[PDB]
Point group: D2
Chain length 66, copies 4
């Protein structure tokens, strides 16, 4: 909540999923991903795109009560 | 709110800033990033990182209010 | 006899042919390969590999004459 | 005389030397270079560029004795 290694994965995903095969490959290595201790079978599809969408709304909502 | 191009640019930026130039380079070309209708001076640093943090916050904030 | 581009193209091919598809892609862009005055429809397969072989013989036979 | 792995390292070199840093890296991985049985410090600078130059001269020498 939320550490270095992870925002990596969250993104490494984004690349795999969005079809950025190369960028996936390269970032996979540069990120030292296969040493990165997260469980990938236990994090959602399009996990990056979403968590973002919401942080925006969290902003949007902080504007409007104020 | 919140198109591919944007989440892309956010990421590209996270790569540079954090020092993943080898990926930064590859991703930029694969995600046609020179054709970006984004003002990069109008992209604060740690942008991806901090937005992402507000997502998670908004998630906790919904779970604990239930 | 023998330009930068020339060797470059020779390599680019080697990457595609040998199926080093990630690098091929990357090297393509780094070595500004699309701007080249090479006819690719004229570049025989196993281009580099076999040119190497002949070089290596030219070493060996310039040693065995003396 | 002349193995798959051999021509790889040779090129991997050329990439570094040539200041093709990004393609050196990706190809470092894609060609499983850390597993390859060459002593890196037992191959001279501009190794690829030259073995090539000679292979072409050998070709020339063959045409001109006929």
């Amino acid at each position: 909540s939320i550490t270095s290694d992870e925002v990596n994965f969250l993104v490494y995903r984004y690349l795999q999923e969005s079809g950025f095969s190369h960028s996936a490959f390269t970032f996979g290595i540069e990120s030292h991903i296969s040493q990165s201790n997260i469980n990938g079978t236990l994090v959602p599809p399009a996990a990056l795109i979403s968590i973002l969408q919401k942080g925006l709304q969290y902003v949007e909502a902080e504007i409007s009560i104020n």
